[PDB]
């Protein structure tokens, strides 16, 4: 479904990496923050929704589901906030594996980057460009949404 | 072409807004930074090229064109760096008008945001969703989707 994203928060080097995954394509955006607060999560979702047509977000935990700053940004940006409960459980494993994959890439580039934030963005780039066509996630998200626009 | 972006740096509230415009669609990504440096520009290009299929960037000035750090990020991300000289001169007035438009949006949301960086991101959202009949966000997806199919 073209508008559905999942939030995912993972830890590395005593810092937090906030990830949004476009569930249908596997495409991601990510940022490093010093910790997951509502204010950070709200800003991150605002950035995401100005860049892709975000209709539904599965939030990553109940604090962010509850957070009034996150609810304000979802209201502002037109995003329906949902809980992120894996009523389908293969769903949990998909995210865990991506966190493992991302950290692996971060490790592979870590020495090319002075700051963790550069390595995370190199990781976003390699993730989004990897051919799986085969098509990449970046190709899949564009195809999904462009098919959707023809409606 | 689907892969061509232009960098654009504008100032407001004694801060700098770095903008990348996807030239064919008008779609933008922007960030606030304390000053335009090679390091900031390099990191911004790295983020953009992980998000969209960036093939050529028209750099905004000669310092960023020259910058070793920007050249390094362009190398890493597979981006051809080009100067941004207005070869067709209508190019130029297009950017100035966009900067004026953005700043207008920023003023209209400014009071809903405590920090300039929130207002800038609200402005990117309004800019990219505005219908002109398709929005810039729809145009960039259609352009690149058409591209992928060949
Ligand atoms: O390869 C593509 O067409 C593509 C489309 C949209 C986003 C990204 C990020 C890396 O590649 C892409
Ligand atoms: O509306 C769309 O399909 C769309 C596609 C790609 C990006 C953006 C940003 C807001 O809207 C979009």
In order, the DSSP letters of A16-55 are: EEEEEEETTTTEEEEEEESS--HHHHHHHHHHHHHHS---
Secondary structure (3-state) at B88 = coil
Structure tokens at A28: 């991601």
Please state, in angstroms and rounded to a whole number, the distance separating the CA atoms of residues A106 and B129. 33
- Contact present, B104 and B117 (Cβ < 8 Å): no
Give me the residue label for tokens 């400014």.
B110
Please state, in angstroms and rounded to a whole number, the distance separating the CA atoms of residues A139 and A39. 31
- Residue ranges in A19-150 assigned as alpha helix (H): 38-51, 62-66, 68-77, 90-109, 116-129, 137-149
Please state, in angstroms and rounded to a whole number, the distance separating the CA atoms of residues B26 and B140. 8
- Contact present, B69 and B38 (Cβ < 8 Å): yes
Q: How far is the CA of B114 from the centre of ligand 1 (A)?
A: 33
> Within a 10 A sphere around the Cβ of A77, how many other Cβ atoms?
20
Structure tokens at B11: 């100032």
Query: From chain A, which residues contact B within 8 Å (Cβ)?
Result: 29, 43, 46-47, 49-53, 76-77, 112, 117-118, 121-122, 124-125, 127-129, 138-139, 142-143, 145-147, 149
Please state, in angstroms and rounded to a whole number, the distance separating the CA atoms of residues A99 and A28. 11
**Residues B148, A128: C-beta atoms closer than 8 Å:** no
Q: Write the burial class of residue B89 (CB in 10 Å: 0-12 exposed, 13-18 middle, 19+ buried).
A: exposed
List Cβ neighbours of A105 (8 Å cut-off, separation of 6 or more): A122, A123, A126, A127
Residue A81 to residues A90, B69, B124, Cα–Cα distance (Å): 21, 39, 21
Contacts A–B by Cβ distance under 8 A: 72
Cα end-to-end span (Å), chain A:
13
Q: How far is the CA of B109 from the centre of ligand 1 (A)?
A: 31
Q: How far is the CA of A13 from the centre of ligand 2 (A)?
A: 34
For A112, the closest chain B residue by CA position comes to: B76
- Contact present, B102 and B121 (Cβ < 8 Å): no
The rounded Cα A115 to chain-centroid distance in angstroms is 20
- Contact present, B30 and B19 (Cβ < 8 Å): yes
- Contact present, A128 and A138 (Cβ < 8 Å): yes
- Contact present, A135 and B64 (Cβ < 8 Å): no
B13 labelled as ligand-binding?
A: no
B93-106 CB burial, b ≥16 within 10 A, e <16: ebbeebbeebbebb
List Cβ neighbours of B137 (8 Å cut-off, separation of 6 or more): A51, A52, A53, B27, B128, B129
State the virtual CA torsion across A25, A26, A27, A29 in degrees, nearest 10. Answer: 140
For B133, the closest chain A residue by CA position comes to: A149
Resolution in angstrom units: 1.8
| Structural domains of chain A sorted by starting position, each given as residue range(s) with its CATH number in brackets | 1-151 (3.30.420.10)
Please state, in angstroms and rounded to a whole number, the distance separating the CA atoms of residues A6 and A20. 6
B67-80 CB burial, b ≥16 within 10 A, e <16: beebbebbebbebe
Cα end-to-end span (Å), chain B:
14
User: Using N-to-C axis directions, what is the helix angle for B90-109 and B116-129, rounded to 10°?
Assistant: 120
């Amino acid at each position: 479904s073209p508008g559905i994203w999942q939030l995912d928060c993972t830890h590395l080097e005593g810092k937090v990496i906030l990830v949004a995954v476009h569930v249908a394509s596997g495409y991601i955006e990510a940022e490093v923050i010093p910790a997951e607060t509502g204010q950070e999560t709200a800003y991150f979702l605002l950035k995401l929704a100005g860049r892709w047509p975000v209709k539904t977000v599965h939030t990553d935990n109940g604090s962010n589901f509850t957070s009034t700053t996150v609810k304000a940004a979802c209201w502002w940006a037109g995003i329906k906030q949902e809980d992120g409960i894996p009523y389908n459980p293969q769903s949990q494993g998909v995210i865990e594996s991506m966190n493992k994959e991302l950290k692996k890439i971060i490790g592979q580039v870590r020495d090319q980057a002075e700051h963790l934030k550069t390595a995370v963005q190199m990781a976003v780039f390699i993730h989004n460009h990897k051919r799986k066509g085969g098509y990449s996630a970046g190709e899949r998200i564009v195809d999904i949404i462009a098919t959707d626009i023809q409606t």
